[PDB]
Design an enzyme around this catalytic site. Sequence first.
Site, PDB file in Angstrom:
ATOM      1  N   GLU A  28       0.845  -1.187   0.000  1.00  0.00           N
ATOM      2  CA  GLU A  28       0.000   0.000   0.000  1.00  0.00           C
ATOM      3  C   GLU A  28       0.882   1.238   0.000  1.00  0.00           C
ATOM      4  O   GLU A  28       0.671   2.126  -0.815  1.00  0.00           O
ATOM      5  CB  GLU A  28      -0.954   0.060   1.202  1.00  0.00           C
ATOM      6  CG  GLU A  28      -2.253  -0.695   1.016  1.00  0.00           C
ATOM      7  CD  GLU A  28      -3.133  -0.161  -0.126  1.00  0.00           C
ATOM      8  OE1 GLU A  28      -3.035   1.051  -0.501  1.00  0.00           O
ATOM      9  OE2 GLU A  28      -3.952  -0.971  -0.631  1.00  0.00           O
ATOM     10  N   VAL A  86      -6.414   0.169  -0.961  1.00  0.00           N
ATOM     11  CA  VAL A  86      -7.133   0.611   0.246  1.00  0.00           C
ATOM     12  C   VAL A  86      -6.584   1.878   0.971  1.00  0.00           C
ATOM     13  O   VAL A  86      -7.225   2.397   1.885  1.00  0.00           O
ATOM     14  CB  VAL A  86      -7.266  -0.584   1.234  1.00  0.00           C
ATOM     15  CG1 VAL A  86      -6.054  -0.684   2.171  1.00  0.00           C
ATOM     16  CG2 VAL A  86      -8.581  -0.511   2.004  1.00  0.00           C
TER      17      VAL A  86
END
Length: 187
Positions: A28, A86
């Site tokens: 991420e 995310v």
Amino acid sequence: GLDAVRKRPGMYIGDTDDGTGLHHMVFEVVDNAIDEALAGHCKEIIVTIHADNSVSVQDDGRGIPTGIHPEEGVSAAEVIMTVLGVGVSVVNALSQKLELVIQREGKIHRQIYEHGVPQAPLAVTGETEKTGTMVRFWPSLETFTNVTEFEYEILAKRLRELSFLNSGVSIRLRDKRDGKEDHFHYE
Ligand SMILES: CCNC(=O)Nc1cc(Nc2cccc(C)c2)c(C(=O)Nc2cccc(C)c2)cn1
């Protein structure tokens, strides 16, 4: 909001008990540096597995924005790191500690979070002739079980893929636990 991510971590990050989610956390952060490279502004990303159970990702791009909203008194950096591919705010929420350091417009800016909650405001910590962003995070041991340490080959495999999917970017992986180093870049 950050409470929701801690209550159901598996929903956000992947499985918390077999390593999957733990490594997704790094990816991420890396995805954000990769987006700075795709925008034309970052040529080298450095991922370092430290010996204190943390990973850092350091890019040489423009630096995360550091301006303050005058009426709110909260920096752009804090907004990025605290509000809900995310997003890095999820990583912060599931990190016992996270350190953001931003080199930008001649100044070094730093902020520390614990479980996503900032500990003090974004602060200037020195001067610099370089630009970029560095995120270092210590994953929460209340969240992750069984595999609570980073594994070089899971990152290496993935960072090699990213380097060939984003040709021109240099990606370096470094392990401080044994001095292992790799350099991924394709033409
Ligand atoms: C280690 C992880 N690396 C990074 O997070 N690199 C990074 C991220 C940047 N912006 C950014 C991050 C997360 C969410 C959003 C919306 C933007 C930016 C960014 O947008 N810089 C920027 C770009 C244009 C203007 C200004 C003032 C700042 C630069 N680098």
